[PDB]
Amino acid sequence: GITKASLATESFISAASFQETTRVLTEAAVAGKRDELRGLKENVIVGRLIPAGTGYAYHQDRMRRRAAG
Amino acid sequence: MLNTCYRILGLKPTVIFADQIMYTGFAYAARSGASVGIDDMVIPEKKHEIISEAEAEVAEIQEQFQSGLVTAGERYNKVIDIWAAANDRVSKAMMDNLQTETVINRDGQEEKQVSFNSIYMMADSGARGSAAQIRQLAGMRGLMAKPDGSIIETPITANFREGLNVLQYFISTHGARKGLADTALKTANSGYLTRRLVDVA
Amino acid sequence: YSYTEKKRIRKDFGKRPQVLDVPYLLSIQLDSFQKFIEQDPEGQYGLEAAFRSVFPIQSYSGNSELQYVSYRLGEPVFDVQECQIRGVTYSAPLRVKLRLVIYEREAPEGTVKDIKEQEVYMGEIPLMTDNGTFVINGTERVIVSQLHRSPGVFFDSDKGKTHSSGKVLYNARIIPYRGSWLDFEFDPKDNLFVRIDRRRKLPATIILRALNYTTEQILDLFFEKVIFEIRDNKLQMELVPERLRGETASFDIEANGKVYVEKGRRITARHIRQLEKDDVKLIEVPVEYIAGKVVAKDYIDESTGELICAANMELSLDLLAKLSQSGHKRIETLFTNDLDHGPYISETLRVDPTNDRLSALVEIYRMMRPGEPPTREAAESLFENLFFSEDRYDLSAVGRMKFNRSLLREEIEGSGILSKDDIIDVMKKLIDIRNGKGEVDDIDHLGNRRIRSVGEMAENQFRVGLVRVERAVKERLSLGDLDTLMPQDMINAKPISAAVKEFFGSSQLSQFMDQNNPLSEITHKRRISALGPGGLTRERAGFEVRDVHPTHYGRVCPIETPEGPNIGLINSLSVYAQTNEYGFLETPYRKVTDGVVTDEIHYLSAIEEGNYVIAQANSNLDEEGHFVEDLVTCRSKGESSLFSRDQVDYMDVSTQQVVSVGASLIPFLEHDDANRALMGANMQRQAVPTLRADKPLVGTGMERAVAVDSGVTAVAKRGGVVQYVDASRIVIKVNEDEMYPGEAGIDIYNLTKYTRSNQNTCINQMPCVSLGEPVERGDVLADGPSTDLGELALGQNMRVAFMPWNGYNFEDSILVSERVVQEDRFTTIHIQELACVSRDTKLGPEEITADIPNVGEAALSKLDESGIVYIGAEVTGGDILVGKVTPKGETQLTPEEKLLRAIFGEKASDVKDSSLRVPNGVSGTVIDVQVFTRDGVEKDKRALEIEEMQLKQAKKDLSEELQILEAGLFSRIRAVLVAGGVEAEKLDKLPRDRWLELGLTDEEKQNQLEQLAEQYDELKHEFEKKLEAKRRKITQGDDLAPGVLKIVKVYLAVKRRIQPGDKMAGRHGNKGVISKINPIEDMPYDENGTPVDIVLNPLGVPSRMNIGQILETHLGMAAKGIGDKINAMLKQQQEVAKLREFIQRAYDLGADVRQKVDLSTFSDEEVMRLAENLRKGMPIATPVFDGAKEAEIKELLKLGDLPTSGQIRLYDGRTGEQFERPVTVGYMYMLKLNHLVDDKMHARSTGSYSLVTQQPLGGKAQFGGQRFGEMEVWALEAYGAAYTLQEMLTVKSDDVNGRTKMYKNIVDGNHQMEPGMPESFNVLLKEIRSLGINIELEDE
Amino acid sequence: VDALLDNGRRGRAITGSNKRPLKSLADMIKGKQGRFRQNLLGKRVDYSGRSVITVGPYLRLHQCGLPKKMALELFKPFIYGKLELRGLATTIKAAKKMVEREEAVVWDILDEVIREHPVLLNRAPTLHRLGIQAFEPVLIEGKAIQLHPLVCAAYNADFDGDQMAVHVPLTLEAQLEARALMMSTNNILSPANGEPIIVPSQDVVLGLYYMTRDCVNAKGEGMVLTGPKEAERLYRSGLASLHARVKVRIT
Amino acid sequence: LSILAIAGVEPYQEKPGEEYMNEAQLAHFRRILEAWRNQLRDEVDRTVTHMQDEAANFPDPVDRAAQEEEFSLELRNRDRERKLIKKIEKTLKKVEDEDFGYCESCGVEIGIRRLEARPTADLCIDCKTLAEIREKQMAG
Ligand SMILES: Nc1nc2c(ncn2[C@@H]2O[C@H](COP(=O)(O)OP(=O)(O)O)[C@@H](OP(=O)(O)OP(=O)(O)O)[C@H]2O)c(=O)[nH]1
């Protein structure tokens, strides 16, 4: 269901926006989770170029610089 | 019309076209002097007749209730139907009178065409108001329902060009307030639904 | 006909006679408060009542008792006017007599000594104005009457949604006026439960055990006994011939030597008629029928003395044998029938973990306060205090009434707390409804909703004030020494005065008076709210209570309710409504005895009204007052139908009584869609008062009632003649009849002049009479704001014509001719109060000196030597009103500033510039300056000039009183001397002061001269003291806050015209925002050349079914027609005859009305004055449901010489050519609401930033930027707007570093952004990192 | 410690002398709903403002009527720049004093920085991407916003006193972003269903309807005219009725 | 009654020796029931076309509540008509099954003239009235 599907998100930063914040962080802090941004919500939080539209150019061009040399 | 302009000439010409439509439509609308006065809201000549007929129809179902031909719960929904019908008769009565009855002549004898009555031009074009709302200005305005939801078995027989009386207005009250109450929440319901949807997309 | 009616008479259509004229509209507020504060020599609610509850207070059984004597209310410290300017609350000191008695140890009920301490002071308690408002800090506030659930017991449902089984449930609730709630509720298993408040559920029978009822008495109380006899061997049974109804035969059932029914045949009307008529008392039975029955009382074995069976234990065929061999002849059993008398209480006992009294009393204590150990003294006292203590519990009288009422008792009053019987009787009645006998109540019915208002609600705040002082008094009475402490040492002031200041200061029911409008005030003071203390919450209920209930008819308005998040949670009081003796809502009706309709009126509460059959408002009765028709439309028990001529018991008083004051002011309302009607009376109160008080051409008749009862106007106390008329004051020389015997004199009304409202509008009174005019008692003496000639004029009507005008009325936008703004007529005057504070900071004191660093003389011109701006100076944005400087030493400037100071030689000051300057964009004239200075700081130059001027002014005012009052008093002395000694010329040669000596021969005329002497010498001295206090109040040190030295309050009078953006609307819910202001050259004009003021869009009318606005426009048009007729004849100077002939014709019109008119009015001097007031137009009245009808309207267009169409032809002012088709023109009364553009319009480039979050924030009234919430961000995400978004929540707001790097780039002419990271997230990183969470930024 | 981290998962330690419970670390992140900072609203924003909206049928669809007073305060850093670029100000501190004085010279400068510099208009409940649209600003004497009537449909704006907010695209990117994505003329089709959302609303259709309509007999009946050009000539001068049956040459 | 009008049917008339429920009588109620059913089907079908036009045009915030009010009345009624059609269909099953004309509680026969007013009647006046009484007591 739409409401349940959204509840599962890879980025832990996104979840603490609209889910219950206390639970999200705890579950994530023990796991040692690494958030790579990639999604929209989190990039707005941290205030950089949205990884779509005009920003897609930048994020794409920078994502490839990663896992490389 | 605007649509076809897009799919044939492209973005730019459609845009500037749409400007011309607005500028001109406003200008000639002003020249037209369309307005609205009391005499614009033409009541059907048959209205008072139609009521007394369906009003006597209730007098049939009444005779049967007191004489036990029909049962009590039954009788409520019987009368409510013969009223609900008469309203559809009154509605398409004024709509036949209002629509075409400007009867005018060209050199020869007689002819009739779509009316040029002010309040009509508005609805047929689609500028504002609909036969639903018009039905409340000239014809009677429907049946209302008490807070229950159970639509009341003696409709609003008056319209807005006439007065309403004490009771008729008081009955009209419920639907208005629930109307406001609902759309206050029907605003919230949209808002919550769209919110859930972007979270998953 | 009266005196200010003779001036201008509204032509009234409408046939139904007014039988009862509108009572005082402020009845509710004024009445309720008067009961609370008043000596009542008995218990009825008041300060006396509250006292008598807590008092007498007695120390901890130490036989040291403090009892309550009586109380007094000190005089107001400042009166209303005084208190307002300065900013104190309008309060009176409360002095209460207290008696401290001491009993010897152990003196047999008698005293060692008692000190009868005179009236200790316990704070000042606020007072209500003449017009039903309070003053809290020089600011008028209103206390909204409240709507809450009536005290008592109410049985409710909760059908359906419960458990998804259907079943329904039934619950009873005992809601007392003060003390804990007692809830009784069922469950699916049909187990009875109780919970106090909303706490933990508990098995219901536990409370019976707490009242010292054991199991046997519980069975005995709620159930019957079925007596089983063992006669011979094996079982007989006592049979009640009724018990067998609703059941089938259990065996071969026979008696009286004849088998009536055999096994398997249900016992019906045949069998019960047989049993009842044949009188079957005893029958023999098998030993197996008691296999299921439950034994009633306790039965033990007579020999071994052991327990055979405990009460409420089910027997078996074997259990009987154990108590049969023990010699038991009786076994009492329960009668159990799951249709009639259900085995409910039996099952409950099996779920009860308790058994005795202390067992339950513990289980109650541990439920209320779990976690801590129970004690013997704790559980008994706690429970005895819950529902049985006079102090901690009370149902009141209303609670006791509905209690006895709902339970079918006879007594209407009794205990104020619950008794052992009361609780049991309730449990009994609750069971009955579940059995099918009886129906449940509903919360919504206005007989179970009660109205409280200020007088009552204040009582509770004093009571809580005392209960928290009572602990303190009891505490002191513990240790107190002999005759050293007295009943003042213990009672503190702060505890009493705080508990009352809390309410009137900040409360959901104490709010800033909605005061832009005499209607706004009167509609506020008559207002209800179901919110706040003791009522529902917006998030709780729940549409049932919000919706309009049938019982609202004639009590609550159906249409005047707010349009927001709480619709129907407010409502407004209906016109004729009044509050029941018991505090319910009643409405007036007419007693129909047999077939005649009487005029004796009865007030019927919501419960009372349902029973009777009430006729309708619009009903035709003639001659003696018989109903004309044999059948009349009426409403009786919640529904409406046709009724017989002689069945109606009552009839509606008026056609109006269903609406509110707001709703009744809409003309042709009947013709307006209900939805738009709400907005009409909703926006009408938001009408800002106009420059020139107009008057509605199209009226309803109510405007006079609203103007007078609202305070804004000045209403004559006593009838008389005008001696002196000034723009300042008005003196009325009183008639002989109304004038009191002594002190004689004249009534002198001091007028309210130009002053700030709650919503920054201006409230100004003006004289409406001329020199030497006759006025009678209860006449209109002076108009308020937005009132004319005694009528309520919330706006100004103008010539309006419906037609598209090149789109400048596209939606509901409005297109206005320049002639309107030129006529300055919708121009509107606003008054803001701006203040400057001299504080004390750690660095030093602030000075109000006119020496301001780095400003030119251009600034210091409007400021006097002392530092205050002059009165009368027309000032604009940026100009300094009050020069002020704050201590800021050692600035620590930088090189280039230092070099700059050295190049141009400025002595870099050790003081900051803090002066109060005029807010950007707003501009007006200074009309008054007040200065409040700390007690003991020297009044500066201007302050002393001011406080000297207030002194010189105050002396002139008081003496003017005496001069006018003397001559008024001396003039009466002259007349009583003439009755038996009249020396007209001889008397007034000698000095008038030398009159008091003259006596009179043996007669009452000698005692009359004596009366004026007494009251003369009192005028001499009362003058003296009124002058003294006035003088002391000016010079006395004005007390301020801590840290603040002195304050300058400047009052500005800004005159705002009207411009695109202002919201305006007619009374029919037609909103619109003025869009362009057109030249008169461009306006649509008619063949007479007269332009039109407003051009409205015809599209707004069909959709929004407000058809009255059209009717208003037409009737208004005809009303202006009569104006143009009289105006022509008045300019022709035709003479009284032709004029009066025409006026007489106007006021009749068609036949059947209620109006009546001349020629009685004195055929000259009076007839001519009227004509003038009509040439502007003839005021007409369309009552709410009694309105005018088209024929009468069309008929008045004929007299006005205007087409019946209501439409004329117009010509476009630009092209000059004709407009095809006729357009409607007419006059529509229109309001300008205070969503005026130059209040809404805000803008900010770079401004102040919030400390916690570096985020644009309104600090200097350069307001915060717009909030760019979640939804506005999704907007940018749907476009590709990646950069537009970054900049939006980076440099434009949160990025402390980016914003300046950007701003510098902007002026450098480089459009870039150097974003970096928002501080909002930087703090989250810190906020998270300060929890146990290690949050880092990885990688690169 | 527990009351410090997340108060409420105990007995609710209260703040000193104050009945209200004290806000903990967890409560400083948590809220309704989630992170307050990211929840609506949503962060206030520089270079912005609002007021009541009105009409202005004289606009082309790609522009809008922006109060003189507002545009002055909004573009304040831009004016300070352009003022000293052309040399009208010695230094920024002088430029500040110039626009404060409202010297008449500045109005002509403001129109420079205004020309090709879009602004964003946004109305109350932002429902679809058309809830924000970009227009070219035209200076207005008055304190109201002028809103092109055809976009009113998309906004579900009437004129019963509704107010709108403005936002200035600062960066060069934001101008070109607002011009190629958010500009009025680039979004005339609803993204929900390919049909035009910039359909003529009400007043404007009542106009065209009455115009292209016919009655049985009126001025001009049956005559013939060379073309549309001279058909207007016939009407504007009162020779022909707007609605009369007529053959004309058209191309 | 416009119900009897919708079909080209006239009130029946039991003749002297006419047997109770015969072929001609069930043919009589079938025409009325189908015509009544056909009329109801047109009401649910028409209504929707107006309903689809209003929902497409967006009302002004002010007239949303006034427009909605007329929509709610229509909606509630329609569900009753759906119930009515389901009751008619249920009554139409009684004709085909040859069990029309009698009381459902007791075997008593329901009047002929009584059935012409409301052909969907299921009980006689005695059982029907008693049922309504139980209702007010078992409900409230
Ligand atoms: N307005 C209307 N209703 C009809 C009509 N025909 C059938 N109904 C619905 O059927 C129900 C009543 O018919 P029955 O099921 O036979 O039960 P009843 O007659 O013994 O009350 C009601 O349901 P209900 O609406 O859910 O409850 P209620 O109306 O009894 O309160 C009623 O509204 C009709 O022609 N008009």
Ligand SMILES: [Mg+2]
């Ligand atoms: Mg709006």
Ligand SMILES: [Zn+2]
């Ligand atoms: Zn039967």
